[PDB]
Amino acid sequence: RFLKVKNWETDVVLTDTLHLKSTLETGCTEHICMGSIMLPSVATKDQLFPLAKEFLDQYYSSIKRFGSKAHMDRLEEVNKEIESTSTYQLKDTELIYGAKHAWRNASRCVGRIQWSKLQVFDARDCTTAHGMFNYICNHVKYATNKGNLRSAITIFPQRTDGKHDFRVWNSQLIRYAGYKQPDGSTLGDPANVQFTEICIQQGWKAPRGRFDVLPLLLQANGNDPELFQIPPELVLEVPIRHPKFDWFKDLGLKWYGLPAVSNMLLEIGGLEFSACPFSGWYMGTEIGVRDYCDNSRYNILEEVAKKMDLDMRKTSSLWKDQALVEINIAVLYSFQSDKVTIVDHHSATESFIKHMENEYRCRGGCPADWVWIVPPMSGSITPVFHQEMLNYRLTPSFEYQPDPWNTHVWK
Amino acid sequence: RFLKVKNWETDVVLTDTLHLKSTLETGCTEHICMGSIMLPSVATKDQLFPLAKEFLDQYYSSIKRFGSKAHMDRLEEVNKEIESTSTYQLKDTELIYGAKHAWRNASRCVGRIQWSKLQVFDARDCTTAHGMFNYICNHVKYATNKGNLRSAITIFPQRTDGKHDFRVWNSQLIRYAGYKQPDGSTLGDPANVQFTEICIQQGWKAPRGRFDVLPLLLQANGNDPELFQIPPELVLEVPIRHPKFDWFKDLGLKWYGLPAVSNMLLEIGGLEFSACPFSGWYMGTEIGVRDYCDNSRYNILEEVAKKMDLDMRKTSSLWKDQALVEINIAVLYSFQSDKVTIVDHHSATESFIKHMENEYRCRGGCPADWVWIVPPMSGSITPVFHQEMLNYRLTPSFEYQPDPWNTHVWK
Numbered sequence: 083r084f085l086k087v088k089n090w091e092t093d094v095v096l097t098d099t100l101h102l103k104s105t106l107e108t109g110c111t112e113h114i115c116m117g118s119i120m121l122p123s124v125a126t127k128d129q130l131f132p133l134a135k136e137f138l139d140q141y142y143s144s145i146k147r148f149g150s151k152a153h154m155d156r157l158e159e160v161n162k163e164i165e166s167t168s169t170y171q172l173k174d175t176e177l178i179y180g181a182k183h184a185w186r187n188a189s190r191c192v193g194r195i196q197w198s199k200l201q202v203f204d205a206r207d208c209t210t211a212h213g214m215f216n217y218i219c220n221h222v223k224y225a226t227n228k229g230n231l232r233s234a235i236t237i238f239p240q241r242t243d244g245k246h247d248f249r250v251w252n253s254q255l256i257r258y259a260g261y262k263q264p265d266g267s268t269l270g271d272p273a274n275v276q277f278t279e280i281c282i283q284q285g286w287k288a289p290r291g292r293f294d295v296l297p298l299l300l301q302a303n304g305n306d307p308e309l310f311q312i313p314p315e316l317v318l319e320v321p322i323r324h325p326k327f328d329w330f331k332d333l334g335l336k337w338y339g340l341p342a343v344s345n346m347l348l349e350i351g352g353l354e355f356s357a358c359p360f361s362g363w364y365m366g367t368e369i370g371v372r373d374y375c376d377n378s379r380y381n382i383l384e385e386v387a388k389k390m391d392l393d394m395r396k397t398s399s400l401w402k403d404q405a406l407v408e409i410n411i412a413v414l415y416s417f418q419s420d421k422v423t424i425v426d427h428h429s430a431t432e433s434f435i436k437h438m439e440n441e442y443r444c445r446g447g448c449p450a451d452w453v454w455i456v457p458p459m460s461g462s463i464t465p466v467f468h469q470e471m472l473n474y475r476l477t478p479s480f481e482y483q484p485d486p487w488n489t490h491v492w493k
Numbered sequence: 494r495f496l497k498v499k500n501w502e503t504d505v506v507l508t509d510t511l512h513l514k515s516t517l518e519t520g521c522t523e524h525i526c527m528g529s530i531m532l533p534s535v536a537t538k539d540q541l542f543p544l545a546k547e548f549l550d551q552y553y554s555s556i557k558r559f560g561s562k563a564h565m566d567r568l569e570e571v572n573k574e575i576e577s578t579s580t581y582q583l584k585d586t587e588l589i590y591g592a593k594h595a596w597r598n599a600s601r602c603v604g605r606i607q608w609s610k611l612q613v614f615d616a617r618d619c620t621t622a623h624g625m626f627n628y629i630c631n632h633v634k635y636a637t638n639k640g641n642l643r644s645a646i647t648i649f650p651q652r653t654d655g656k657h658d659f660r661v662w663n664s665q666l667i668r669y670a671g672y673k674q675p676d677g678s679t680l681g682d683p684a685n686v687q688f689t690e691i692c693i694q695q696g697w698k699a700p701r702g703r704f705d706v707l708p709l710l711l712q713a714n715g716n717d718p719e720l721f722q723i724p725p726e727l728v729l730e731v732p733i734r735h736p737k738f739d740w741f742k743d744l745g746l747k748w749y750g751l752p753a754v755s756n757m758l759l760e761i762g763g764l765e766f767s768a769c770p771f772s773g774w775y776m777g778t779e780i781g782v783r784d785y786c787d788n789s790r791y792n793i794l795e796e797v798a799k800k801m802d803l804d805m806r807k808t809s810s811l812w813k814d815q816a817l818v819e820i821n822i823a824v825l826y827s828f829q830s831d832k833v834t835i836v837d838h839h840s841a842t843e844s845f846i847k848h849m850e851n852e853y854r855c856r857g858g859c860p861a862d863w864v865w866i867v868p869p870m871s872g873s874i875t876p877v878f879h880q881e882m883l884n885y886r887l888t889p890s891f892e893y894q895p896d897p898w899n900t901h902v903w904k
């Protein structure tokens with residue numbers, strides 16, 4: 083009931099008691115581990131108050147007023163509001179605390195050493211798609227900060243009955259279109275082919291090219307979603323060059339500077355924020371390994387290896403591995419030379435170990451998903467590979483949610 | 494109760510029912526996933542018969558005689574022997590079946606497409622350390638097969654009371670010594686510094702160099718263990734060269750051809766084989782990534798990157814990654830050019846996906862430990878990265894066991 087996690091490169095042993103405060107379930111049982119399953123698996127007024135009290139108890143505990151008068155009054159205040167409306171409203175402080183701790187609790191996030199430096203934009207007064215566009219544009223501008231990227235989240239009104247949901251239909255605020263071809267192939271980003279066509283459906287005029295920034299499909303108060311084009315001046319992009327290979331420019335690669343996830347659900351004190359786009363900055367491998375080299379994405383290992391004059395006949399020449407490293411040197415160099423914030427997997431994973439030490443010390447643990455914390459290349463030459471991590475679900479949290487077009491009663 | 498595992502690079506969905514036959518526990522619970530914990534966690538006559546019946550039921554099921562007469566007679570035969578001796582003895586057939594299915598069931602093993610091509614050497618007649626030496630030498634010779642490596646296991650007598658244990662004290666039949674220095678550093682292999690000194694304790698005359706093949710410390714029928722030197726002609730080694738870089742020979746690296754794990758416990762039908770060295774062949778990354786580049790092992794990234802004239806100032810130059818790929822190209826090339834069996838992580842992981850398809854089809858599932866199946870480099874450009882895997886414990890199995898020197902009543 084006081085579990086030990088060991089690092090097998092440093093022999094450092096940490097004791098986890100934070101998992102006792104864990105609430106939701108993992109998918110694993112005593113007889114089957116599901117730690118590599120990608121997606122493991124209205125709310126009534128009765129269930130709502132324990133969730134609110136639990137959250138308020140940790141909130142007031144964190145500002146050194148657990149069990150105090152202001153705590154008990156707010157406890158009764160929220161209870162009374164849950165009796166009346168069968169929901170309640172967070173204080174601006176509680177909202178900022180909740181968001182930061184959702185990030186703090188995201189066991190799949192290697193970036194969490196930054197969890198308390200988070201800019202929270204309260205968009206709970208938003209009522210229309212245009213207001214969402216406006217809030218999102220200001221989020222992009224702020225977070226991007228001329229390349230000195232700043233972490234931020236924008237929080238649209240919480241779910242109520244379920245039929246009045248705020249949703250950003252994009253998976254990320256900024257992402258490249260994907261179109262299939264006549265010859266059945268794919269131009270742009272295969273990840274977003276379905277979404278790219280939904281925009282064409284709702285009325286997008288697609289410039290059927292490669293790195294075409296998709297419009298925003300924004301759903302406000304449950305209404306049908308509406309298209310908006312982010313001002314191109316708000317969309318910072320990095321042309322990808324290599325510090326040694328000058329043909330690398332000929333590759334004509336580029337990526338956007340701001341990773342801003344928009345399809346996830348923020349849960350705070352039993353309250354559900356179905357539109358909560360959050361952004362930080364990229365770890366290089368996200369672009370150079372997954373975005374550029376997944377077979378189901380841009381899949382550029384073919385071309386890079388060609389131009390490097392690599393033995394592509396035998397699988398065992400490791401030509402894929404060799405081209406993979408060159409690609410990630412190029413992403414890092416291009417972002418850094420352009421003064422666009424980026425972190426390499428070595429710096430980010432070292433920081434996560436240091437983050438883990440902090441959390442075990444000042445918090446009793448750090449929920450952590452090894453399958454996701456270890457980078458998609460060079461696993462064991464990073465310190466997280468050798469770090470045992472206990473995964474468990476703490477709240478506040480970021481949750482997955484259905485794509486809105488699979489659930490939305492249209493019109 | 495009929496779980497689905499998905500591949501997110503092919504969209505292939507497999508249905509697992511084999512996990513229903515799972516028996517032992519995983520370490521995970523509904524509230525905490527331990528899938529990245531490295532080591533998760535006498536036997537009486539009462540517990541022994543269900544374990545034997547369970548094993549015999551799958552054995553006779555596999556030779557198309559489940560519930561037949563020979564099955565029931567052997568069931569009664571084993572029951573009667575467990576009544577008499579409070580243990581029992583496997584038939585040679587049952588022993589070969591059990592070993593193969595222990596390998597088949599090893600969820601951390603990416604090599605299991607070969608699980609049924611396994612040479613089982615019955616050493617249950619062995620009584621002394623010298624007999625162990627003899628059996629082990631024949632295992633080495635057979636398995637090595639002039640470089641056309643052949644998988645094999647040698648199975649010494651099963652545990653009885655507990656104080657009469659056969660143990661190979663080496664972690665692997667073939668491994669390099671590790672000695673600390675006067676300046677507190679380490680020569681050879683830091684992994685085996687403790688074991689290397691135990692041999693010096695029991696009487697080894699160490700040639701205090703780098704790639705010094707350790708002697709065998711063999712414990713027979715619970716007696717104190719005894720040193721034996723494997724004939725050097727039985728120890729096939731590969732000098733590590735690169736197909737492009739001729740300074741790579743100057744590195745003077747070499748590794749042994751035969752990975753042969755000797756410290757694990759084979760469980761068959763509740764019976765415990767505490768000395769069961771098994772060998773196959775290497776996946777390249779084992780040597781080139783872990784053996785050569787773990788900070789706690791040979792740790793050669795420093796030197797390789799130096800000789801490649803790599804920007805070692807910044808962490809973000811990915812100089813570690815770049816030297817890592819060169820090292821693994823060199824291991825593969827050296828083994829292949831020497832006609833010593835080796836598999837690259839691309840071929841081995843593709844084979845494991847194909848192995849998984851077979852097992853889900855003809856067996857209802859394949860227990861698989863993603864944390865261990867995904868190679869220590871180039872994770873996501875291999876197909877296992879994108880393969881959801883359910884981990885669960887099937888028997889027969891290979892189990893970890895204490896190091897014998899922490900448990901052995903000496904003299």
Ligand code: HEM
Pocket residue numbers: 181184185188190191192193194196200233234235360361362363364365368425430454480
């Ligand atoms: C500040 C720099 C940050 C870095 C370097 C970083 C890094 C990462 C990376 C590499 C992943 C893996 C995602 C993938 O492979 O698809 C991830 C996941 C995640 N990040 Fe962070 N992140 C940062 C900021 C944030 C912020 C500000 C939040 C929330 C406010 C956040 C919440 C999450 C969540 C919830 C996940 C899990 C997503 C999932 O399960 O699919 N991250 N992060």
Ligand code: HEM
Pocket residue numbers: 592595596599601602603604605607611644645646771772773774775776779836841865891
């Ligand atoms: C024939 C070619 C084989 C290949 C390419 C292969 C590959 C591997 C690799 C790369 C690992 C990870 C080990 C580590 O990283 O330390 C592993 C683990 C393992 N292998 Fe296989 N192996 C082969 C044969 C065998 C055989 C013949 C057996 C048993 C008879 C076996 C049983 C196991 C077990 C039990 C583990 C898990 C060890 C642990 O949990 O520490 N393997 N294998």
Ligand SMILES: N=C(Nc1ccc(CCNCc2cccc(NC(=N)c3nccs3)c2)cc1)c1nccs1
Pocket residue numbers: 120193273341342343360361362363364365368376378501502
């Ligand atoms: N779609 C697929 N599955 C799939 C399902 C779910 C997911 C969730 C991925 N969340 C994206 C994400 C989440 C969190 C962080 C990042 N990055 C970042 N630095 C940041 N953003 C914002 C702040 S930091 C990116 C990803 C993939 C497929 N894969 C292959 C063929 S289909």
Ligand SMILES: N=C(Nc1ccc(CCNCc2cccc(NC(=N)c3nccs3)c2)cc1)c1nccs1
Pocket residue numbers: 090091531604684752753754771772773774775776779787789
């Ligand atoms: N000792 C450490 N922990 C640790 C604890 C336990 C283990 C178990 C590793 N089983 C070695 C092994 C097992 C199975 C396969 C291989 N390979 C092979 N191809 C084959 N052999 C035989 C047939 S195939 C190798 C490994 C490491 C440390 N790591 C860093 C600092 S300490």
Ligand SMILES: C[C@H](O)[C@H](O)[C@H]1CNc2nc(N)[nH]c(=O)c2N1
Pocket residue numbers: 117118119120453454455501878879880881882
């Ligand atoms: C099957 C497996 O769970 C899936 O590929 C996961 C593996 N680990 C990952 N880790 C990160 N950071 N991101 C991912 O998309 C994935 N994908």
Ligand SMILES: C[C@H](O)[C@H](O)[C@H]1CNc2nc(N)[nH]c(=O)c2N1
Pocket residue numbers: 090467468469470471528529530531864865866
């Ligand atoms: C902490 C973590 O469980 C540990 O480093 C594991 C990770 N995955 C591994 N995978 C393999 N094949 N071999 C290993 O030794 C390890 N080590």
Ligand SMILES: [Zn+2]
Pocket residue numbers: 110114115116117521525526527528
């Ligand atoms: Zn688990």
